[PDB]
Design an enzyme around this catalytic site. Structure first.
Site, PDB file in Angstrom:
ATOM      1  N   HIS A  62       0.728  -1.239   0.041  1.00 16.85           N
ATOM      2  CA  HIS A  62      -0.037   0.076  -0.030  1.00 16.85           C
ATOM      3  C   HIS A  62       0.829   1.170   0.066  1.00 16.85           C
ATOM      4  CE1 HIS A  62      -0.281  -0.342   4.501  1.00 16.85           C
ATOM      5  NE2 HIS A  62      -0.408  -1.618   4.242  1.00 16.85           N
ATOM      6  N   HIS A  92       6.034   6.714   6.324  1.00 17.79           N
ATOM      7  CA  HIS A  92       5.698   6.428   4.977  1.00 17.79           C
ATOM      8  C   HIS A  92       5.194   7.646   4.273  1.00 17.79           C
ATOM      9  CE1 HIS A  92       2.027   6.068   7.290  1.00 17.79           C
ATOM     10  NE2 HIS A  92       1.418   6.520   6.321  1.00 17.79           N
ATOM     11  N   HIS A  94       1.871   9.027   1.211  1.00 18.65           N
ATOM     12  CA  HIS A  94       0.927   8.898   0.085  1.00 18.65           C
ATOM     13  C   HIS A  94       1.248   9.899  -0.952  1.00 18.65           C
ATOM     14  CE1 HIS A  94      -1.291   6.761   3.712  1.00 18.65           C
ATOM     15  NE2 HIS A  94      -0.591   7.595   4.268  1.00 18.65           N
ATOM     16  N   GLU A 104      -3.315  13.470   1.502  1.00 20.29           N
ATOM     17  CA  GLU A 104      -4.508  12.991   2.300  1.00 20.29           C
ATOM     18  C   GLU A 104      -5.179  14.154   2.929  1.00 20.29           C
ATOM     19  OE1 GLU A 104      -3.383   9.420   4.838  1.00 20.29           O
ATOM     20  OE2 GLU A 104      -4.224   8.624   3.051  1.00 20.29           O
ATOM     21  N   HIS A 117       4.128  11.005   6.682  1.00 18.61           N
ATOM     22  CA  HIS A 117       3.429  10.519   7.923  1.00 18.61           C
ATOM     23  C   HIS A 117       4.670   9.883   8.745  1.00 18.61           C
ATOM     24  CE1 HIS A 117      -0.894  10.194   6.137  1.00 18.61           C
ATOM     25  NE2 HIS A 117      -0.406  11.669   6.608  1.00 18.61           N
ATOM     26  N   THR A 196      -5.232   6.432   8.438  1.00 22.34           N
ATOM     27  CA  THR A 196      -5.950   6.682   7.412  1.00 22.34           C
ATOM     28  C   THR A 196      -6.067   5.587   6.450  1.00 22.34           C
ATOM     29  OG1 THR A 196      -3.993   7.138   6.124  1.00 22.34           O
ATOM     30  CG2 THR A 196      -5.428   9.133   7.439  1.00 22.34           C
TER      31      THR A 196
HETATM   32  N1  LIG Z   1      -1.673   6.539   7.295  1.00 22.52           N
HETATM   33  S1  LIG Z   1      -1.352   6.597   8.976  1.00 22.52           S
HETATM   34  O1  LIG Z   1      -0.151   7.187   9.215  1.00 22.52           O
HETATM   35  O2  LIG Z   1      -2.495   7.266   9.200  1.00 22.52           O
HETATM   36  C1  LIG Z   1      -1.432   4.988   9.527  1.00 22.52           C
HETATM   37  N2  LIG Z   1      -2.324   4.216   9.009  1.00 22.52           N
HETATM   38  C2  LIG Z   1      -2.201   2.950   9.635  1.00 22.52           C
HETATM   39  C3  LIG Z   1      -1.078   2.807  10.353  1.00 22.52           C
HETATM   40  S2  LIG Z   1      -0.267   3.914  10.149  1.00 22.52           S
HETATM   41 ZN   LIG Z   2      -0.227   7.592   6.302  1.00 24.27          ZN
END
Ligand SMILES: NS(=O)(=O)c1nccs1
Ligand SMILES: [Zn+2]
Ligand SMILES: NS(=O)(=O)c1nccs1
EC number: 4.2.1.1
Length: 258
Positions: A62, A92, A94, A104, A117, A196
């Site tokens: 993903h 990571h 997006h 996002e 993130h 998310t």
């Molecule tokens: N995209 S996020 O940082 O909100 C995240 N989601 C799941 C594990 S970390």
């Molecule tokens: Zn994220």
């Protein structure tokens, strides 16, 4: 088959397996800069990544995660809106198929080309798996990427992506310094929200930096060469792996700056 970002398993389908998709505190959201209340009681964010220990980089189908040693208090986020101490476990991004989309969170409806993130977990819950079951379990630092000048401190991450092209591939990734992904200013907005990606747990204090980093077109192009699929499957480019903005509902976005 499972959830993903395509027409048949994308964000609009997620609710069927993760009913909290439609919950009261979902992420991301649009940050309306004129409605966000300056809050003079917010503290400066404390980002202490001096002793950060990156270990590995992984394509999990993903996105790609750069993982850190979280067995000690080596890379922590404190201060800001947070009580206590949150350890860096992974970062990571997006991003989009085109520079016009990819983030996002949005800022007065503006989409950035990507979003970083840096995910941290509340050390009072002991491990990441326990933290995600708690309303103040995670602290995610969100940074917008716009396309322009290259970010020298991102290059090491882009150069290794060749080696983790498809789902389940990983590569050793030591001595990476995440401090070279930060912008100059630590002005931020904050609100309570969720993961998310599924399972979409409502465990996140979001801290989204006002100042974007600038990355080059070539850098973001290298993100878009990765694959959602595994080795020897039909090639599906890993692009548009962002969840669109969700309803703000009963929430206030606070700003750390005037
Ligand atoms: N995209 S996020 O940082 O909100 C995240 N989601 C799941 C594990 S970390
Ligand atoms: Zn994220
Ligand atoms: N709810 S879900 O996104 O995991 C999904 N599974 C199959 C089609 S859509």
């Amino acid at each position: 088959h499972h959830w993903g970002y395509g027409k048949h398993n994308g964000p609009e389908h997620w609710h069927k397996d993760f009913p909290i998709a439609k919950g009261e505190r979902q992420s991301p959201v649009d940050i309306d800069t004129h409605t966000a209340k300056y809050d003079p009681s917010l503290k400066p964010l404390s980002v202490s990544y001096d002793q950060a220990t990156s270990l590995r980089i992984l394509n999990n189908g993903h996105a790609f995660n750069v993982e850190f040693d979280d067995s000690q208090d080596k890379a922590v986020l404190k201060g800001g809106p947070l009580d206590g101490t949150y350890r860096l476990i992974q970062f990571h991004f997006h991003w989009g198929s085109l520079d016009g989309q990819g983030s996002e969170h949005t800022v007065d409806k503006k989409k950035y080309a990507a979003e970083l993130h840096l995910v941290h977990w509340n050390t009072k819950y002991g491990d990441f798996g326990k933290a995600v079951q708690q309303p103040d379990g995670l602290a995610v630092l969100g940074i917008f990427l716009k396309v322009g000048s290259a970010k020298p401190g991102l290059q090491k991450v882009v150069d290794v992506l060749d080696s983790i092209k498809t789902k389940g591939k990983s590569a050793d990734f030591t001595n990476f310094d995440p401090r070279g992904l930060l912008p100059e200013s630590l002005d931020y907005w904050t609100y309570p929200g969720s993961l998310t990606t599924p399972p979409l747990l409502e465990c996140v204090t979001w801290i989204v930096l006002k100042e974007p980093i600038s990355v080059s077109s070539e850098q973001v192009l290298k993100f878009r060469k990765l694959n959602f699929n595994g080795e020897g499957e039909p090639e599906e480019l890993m692009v548009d792996n962002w969840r669109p903005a969700q309803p703000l509902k009963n929430r206030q976005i606070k700003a750390s700056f005037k």
